[PDB]
Structures are given as structure tokens and as C-alpha cells.
Fold this sequence. Notes:
ADP binds at residues 221-226, 255, 481. Residues 349-526 form the Helicase C-terminal domain. This is Genome polyprotein. Mg(2+) 2 binds at residues 225, 305. Mg(2+) 1 binds at residues 225, 304-305. By secondary structure, this protein is an alpha/beta fold. It folds into five domains: 1-108, Thrombin, subunit H (Beta Barrel), CATH 2.40.10; 110-193 and 638-645, Thrombin, subunit H; 194-342, 3-Layer(aba) Sandwich (Rossmann fold); 343-500, P-loop containing nucleotide triphosphate hydrolases (Rossmann fold, 3-Layer(aba) Sandwich); 501-634, RNA Helicase, Chain A, domain 3, CATH 1.10.820.10. It is built from 16 helices and 33 strands. The strands form seven sheets. It has a seven-stranded antiparallel sheet with strand order 2-1-3-4-5-7-6. The chain has a seven-stranded mixed sheet with strand order 14-20-19-15-18-16-17, sandwiched between helices. The protein is globular, with a radius of gyration of 26 Å. Bound molecules: zinc ion. Zinc ion binds at residues 111-113, 115, 159, 161, 163.
Amino acid sequence: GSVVIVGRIILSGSGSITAYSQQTRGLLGCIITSLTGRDKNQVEGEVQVVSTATQSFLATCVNGVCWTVYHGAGSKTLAGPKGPITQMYTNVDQDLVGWQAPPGARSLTPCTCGSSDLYLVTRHADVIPVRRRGDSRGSLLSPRPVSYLKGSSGGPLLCPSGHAVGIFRAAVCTRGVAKAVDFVPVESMETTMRSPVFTDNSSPPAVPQSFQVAHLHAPTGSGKSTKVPAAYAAQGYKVLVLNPSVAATLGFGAYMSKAHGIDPNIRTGVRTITTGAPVTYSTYGKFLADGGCSGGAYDIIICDECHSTDSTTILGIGTVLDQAETAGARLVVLATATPPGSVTVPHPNIEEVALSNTGEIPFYGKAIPIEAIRGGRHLIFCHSKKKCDELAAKLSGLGINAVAYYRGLDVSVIPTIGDVVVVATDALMTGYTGDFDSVIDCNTCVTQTVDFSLDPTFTIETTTVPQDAVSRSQRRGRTGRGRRGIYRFVTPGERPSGMFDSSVLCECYDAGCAWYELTPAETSVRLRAYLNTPGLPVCQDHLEFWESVFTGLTHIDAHFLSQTKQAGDNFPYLVAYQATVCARAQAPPPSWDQMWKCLIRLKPTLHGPTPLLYRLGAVQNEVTLTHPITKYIMACMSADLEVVT
Ligand SMILES: [Zn+2]
């Protein structure tokens, strides 16, 4: 659906800067208009209140373009008088998108006076004084709870003359209290408008004389992982290809041997082969385990699937970006079919059929026709293992060959020949390479998000959420490979791609500490290189914060860590660290959930309140906050933390 204008904030044209709202449509009008994308309402003023189905924020017209934040609007169209208006500009790096302003809208114009005295206009038509502190930052004269700024993303910062200085995008907070604001400066918008609207990154980059980072955006099946490195090698270059999937990596190796007649080096935890060839396929995980870039080893490093937002890929790519030039590489290629801001479009081979309630098998509130999976080989994506186990069972007793696949299981449980219905989490994507007669998609994913909850420190929350465009296209791509395919779905849309949560940075420090012998300072260097690089997935910059947390977690119990590592669940370092503090106090873990299984054998000797460090799940035991590590982390919570509004 489209973003819809539901009101405006009218600004005074003389005297002191003041504002007032005008609400132009209600909930029903908004939803209808979002669906058609056709909005016949008169548009007035320059600051628009806009809404999607779920959120509301602001959009500001400057120089004839209606601007707002990517984190709010994603790549969505804007409902307009002649139908949906497509974005003219989408800049995920800057968190800024623009639509050509619909007729009737007035525009603000850039400030010429250079004043440092700014005024932020909120969705409630408050006018808030802000002292400019740098290109994109300003301090609030009166700090306010961050809730006060929520839904004001996309609103203008004005100079005392009422001209545009920039567009509000995030609040910098000290323990939930906004002390400063982050905004996209107007000169970035001016530059955008002077620059091309259309760009092409589909051709393999030429190898420059000196180090460059380049992007390769090219369709699945275009040969990014195979054809491209083989060509570079044919030209005399040494090439490293990094991929998030062990199965894919091992597969590229076999394919190159039997096709281009070269047996590449292969580097994975399960299988490492040195052939001396000028091409090496590695996982990001094994590359990190190997210590990153070997001096003089490669001319070209291709970071394959560079849109991937798992912590291993991010840490791996940050490592390449920080080390490649010094290691003597000439080219880093950031390769993906789905770069930030990309959206899924129709595929010639794949018919997409919405599920209905007519069907013999209940599926995520809808139903699957038993006749749709009866003959053949099929893939059903579920959000969880528990759901895979259930739906499988509803098939082993209902008379069908069906197996569940998810993290922890061996790939051979999936038959490669014979009729089958595979029921899997996204773990499939990196464990198994094959394709299917059809794909059925629940259209939801499990994700982790950090909450700076101060109770006492932070919480990592696990929730099920609607899939993003990357998820949709990757799940859908498991069918229609070279031959006719069918994609059935529960919900039609997709969340915007190219963004990831601060909890993922937490996971990077955790892996640095648990697996790769990286000090948190070293981890920060690698993650900074990633964050400093345009065209990659984006995230809030919480590096100093996470570094400070892990820096204090010293003298972990080596045995507990060895166990959490092998068990393969998330946050092995944070888990083993909480277990260490508990064991040393002879205190019970936060609960007896399986997360805490390394303590189970000690159960009869653990008593009293848990010295709680942070929250990674439900806490059922009574807690104490007196432990020095708890106090240390609480102190860490005082850091400036930028959060979107
Ligand atoms: Zn001015």
C-alpha cells in the first residue's frame, strides 16, 4: 500500500515561528487511499502528516520534492491525484526518500543565513528550539522524553527565518531522555536533486589500478558467485569469494571444477581444501576464523550476498573493508541481487497464488489445499522449529512423506529424490541449495530487537514479524528455477529491506569474544569500516555502547563458554557470562529455560536471587542488582544512544 497524507502542519509566514495541525482524513479514508494509491484531496502547506497502515510520521516539501525518512516510508509510493507516486529518490544511507510533490503542495526553501538557532516542528505542531552543533546534529534547549518526538520523523528543522535546515530523523538519548536530534541536512537533499535518478551496477566492476570498493547488483542466476570470479581468474587475478552459506560455498567449488576446469581452494568449518588455485571459496565464518585477510593473498575479494544481515556476514564484511587495502587487494566487490531499498517484482516463471480459507490444512490463519502438495516435491516456510515439527506431524499421520528442517539438524534428512514436502525455517537457505515444485510462505520471520529497558540494563526481545523484501524474494526463489513454479502466500506485501537492529551489533561483539578472539576494541574497528561504507544495510551507530558493555565482561568461565558455543544458540558469550556470575555466587540462573542448560547439573546447589546482568528472556527467579558487573552495565546505559522516532 501507499503512504497517505492524513493532515498537515501549517507554519506561520511572519513573526515568531508557530504551527498548527489540520487533520484531513480519518482511519477509514487512510486505509482505502493506501490500497488504491489514489488521493484526490486538495493538498496544502509544506509539512504533511503521513501514514501507512501501521505508523504515522511527517513528510516535508523542500524545493518541490516531498521528503521523508526511509525508516518510515521504505520504498513505498505516495498516494496522489493521478494514482500512486513512485519515489524519485531513495537514499538508505542518508535515511531519506523523496516523491515529486503532488500539485497544491507548497515547498520550503533552504536557509541562506547560516544561523545556529534552529526550530524543530513536531507532529503535534510543537515548535522546539534546537542549537545546531554540527552538520547533522543539534541539542535540545529542553531535554524531553523520547516519546515526545515519536512520529515526528520527516519533520523540518527551521532557521529563525522559517527556511529549511534539514529533516529530523532520530533522537540522541541519555537513558530514554532526548538531549539532541539527528537530521538530514538540506545540502544533502540539494546534492541528491543535482544527481542522477537512475544508476546501473549490473556489470562486473573492472579491476582498478589502486584499491576501490564497488557494488554488483545483478539478478539471481546471473552468475555473480560463479561466472564472475571465473572470469576475473581467467584474466590473471587471484579471487576470494565469501558467502554466508556453507552449502552454497561447497557447491560453487564443485561447479567450478566441472565447468571452468579449475579446482578452487575451499574454506569451510566442515571442509577445507588447498589446491593452490587462484580462486578460493570461503564462508564469512571460516574467513573470520582464519583471521581475516592474509597479506598479498588476493587481488579481488567478492563479498557475496552482501545484503545479508546476520552478524557473521556483517562482521566478515567489516573485516574485509578494514583489511583489504593493506592486504594488497585492488578490488572489493559487494555483490547482491537485493541491495538496500530494493523491492520484489514479478518473476516470469513463478505464478503467485494467495492462499484462502478454502483448504484442508490450516496454515497461519489461512488454509492449504491438500491437492496442492499431494504429488511432487514442495517447500513450506514456517517461522519456527516448533511450527515445522507440528505441521510435519500433521503430515506423517495424514499420509504424506514430510520432513522438518531447521538449525541443528543434518541436511541429509532432506531427500534429494522422491516425493516430499519439506517444512523449514530460513535455516534452509544456508543449509540446502535445491529448488522445489512450489513454495508456500507464511510471510513471517522471527527477529531479535534490543530494548534499552533500564530494568536494570537492556533486554533482547524475540518476536515474530512480517517478512521484508529480501526474505520474500529469497523464499520465493526456491521455486521457478529454470522451469515453471508456484508461490503461495498468506499476506501480499513486504517490509522494506536494507535495515538491521542494534541487537545484531551486540551479536557481533558476542561472536568476536566467543569465537574469533577479537577484543571489543578490535570488533569496533571492523564494524566501523562496515558502517562507514555506503550502499550496505544500515543500522543505528551503537558501537561505543556495545564495546563498553563487552569490555567489562572479563574472566568468563571457559567451560560454560565452551558449552554455549557448541550448543549453537544465540549470544553464547552473554549467556555463558551470566552463567559464570551465577555459578560464582552459587545463585540460580534467571530461569530454568533451556537457554540456561549449562547450569542444570548444578541445580541442587544454587539458591537465592539471580545477580541479573541483562535480560535475554523471561526471568522467573528473584533478582539482585548488587553485583559489580550489573553496576558496570548500568553505568554503560548512560552513553548517548541514537534511536529512531
Ligand atoms: Zn536561515
